[PDB]
Every structure is written in structure tokens, then in C-alpha cells.
């Protein structure tokens, strides 16, 4: 049968929150750290996070949109029951 | 003194990795889950992740750029010592 979403929904929620919050959390570190300001260490840290998150936003946004595209359609084509 | 980056660098690395990899990890779930395809549960899950990550990319990208802007300049203005 379909390994659907019930228990996995929690993992989805828990990780959704963890992923987004941890990213922002780390930015919170950077500001709380910028209270004293580090050299290239700080610069490199957030710069990597920034170039990575943006690079990844592009790949993941397109991925996500397409992944759900095929899933959304695929699911509502196959799931026609209650 | 400055609460600088040495031990915090590891937390930065560990969390940078955890944040980005967990987001992609969760996409991996979605595809491994789309192998069977869930209804609105799947749709809602990734759609939220997508709208959130993009909303947040915008806020965090601008934040990060400005946070390091002030930190980069501020730090290299203050840190002129070895």
C-alpha cells in the first residue's frame, strides 16, 4: 500500500520547523556574535550560509515545485478514493 | 573581550550543515514518499516548506547580507590587531 502521511507528517512538521528555525537561529547567533564582531571567521560563516541558502533556494524551490507537481498530479490521479 | 569565533565556529559548521542538509533531507523524504504519493498531506507539506523557504530566503538573504555588512565593516574597523 501507499506509505502515506500520518506519522511521517509529524517528522515533516518537526523537521520543517527545525530546518527553518535552525537557519534563523544561526543568524541569531551571528547577530549575538556581531555584538562583538568577529573577523573573516564571521564573514566566512554567514557568507557561506548566504550563498548556500540562496543557491539551494533556487535548486530546492524548483525541485519542490516540480516534486509536488508530479506528486500533486500523480496523487490526485491515483487517489480517487476515500 | 570579544566573544569571538573558535568554538562557535564548530556550532556554525554543525548547524550550517544540519540546516541545509535537513531541508534537502526532508525533500528526500518527499520524493521517497512520492514513490507512493500522498494527497493534500504531501501537497501541504512541501508547499509550506516551499513558500516558507522562499519567504525566508528573501528575509534571511537580505538580513544576512546586511548583518554581515555591518559586521564585516564593523569588525575590520575594530579588529586591526593580530
From Swiss-Prot, chains A, B:
Changes after translation: Glycosylation is required for cell surface expression. Phosphorylated predominantly on Ser residues.
Annotated consequence of substituting residue 46 to R: Abolishes colocalization with ORAI1 and activation of CRAC channels
Domain characteristics, as noted in the entry: The microtubule tip localization signal (MtLS) motif; mediates interaction with MAPRE1 and targeting to the growing microtubule plus ends.
Subunit details: Monomer in the presence of Ca(2+); it oligomerizes in absence of Ca(2+). Forms homooligomers and heterooligomers with STIM2. Interacts with pore-forming subunits of CRAC channels, ORAI1, ORAI2 and ORAI3; this interaction is potentiated upon Ca(2+) store depletion. Interacts (via the transmembrane region and the SOAR/CAD domain) with SPPL3; the interaction promotes the binding of STIM1 to ORAI1. Interacts (via the SOAR/CAD domain) with ORAI1. Interacts with MAPRE1; probably required for targeting to the growing microtubule plus ends.
Associated disease: Immunodeficiency 10: An immune disorder characterized by recurrent infections, impaired activation and proliferative response of T-cells, decreased T-cell production of cytokines, lymphadenopathy, and normal lymphocytes counts and serum immunoglobulin levels. Additional features include thrombocytopenia, autoimmune hemolytic anemia, myopathy, partial iris hypoplasia, hepatosplenomegaly and defective enamel dentition. Myopathy, tubular aggregate, 1: A rare congenital myopathy characterized by regular arrays of membrane tubules on muscle biopsies without additional histopathological hallmarks. Tubular aggregates in muscle are structures of variable appearance consisting of an outer tubule containing either one or more microtubule-like structures or amorphous material. They may occur in a variety of circumstances, including inherited myopathies, alcohol- and drug-induced myopathies, exercise-induced cramps or muscle weakness.
Note: Transfection of STIM1 into cells derived from a rhabdoid tumor and from a rhabdomyosarcoma that do not express detectable levels of STIM1 can induce cell death, suggesting a possible role in the control of rhabdomyosarcomas and rhabdoid tumors.
Described function: Acts as a Ca(2+) sensor that gates two major inward rectifying Ca(2+) channels at the plasma membrane: Ca(2+) release-activated Ca(2+) (CRAC) channels and arachidonate-regulated Ca(2+)-selective (ARC) channels. Plays a role in mediating store-operated Ca(2+) entry (SOCE), a Ca(2+) influx following depletion of intracellular Ca(2+) stores. Upon Ca(2+) depletion, translocates from the endoplasmic reticulum to the plasma membrane where it activates CRAC channel pore-forming subunits ORA1, ORA2 and ORAI3 to generate sustained and oscillatory Ca(2+) entry. Involved in enamel formation.
Protein name according to UniProt: Stromal interaction molecule 1
Organism: Homo sapiens
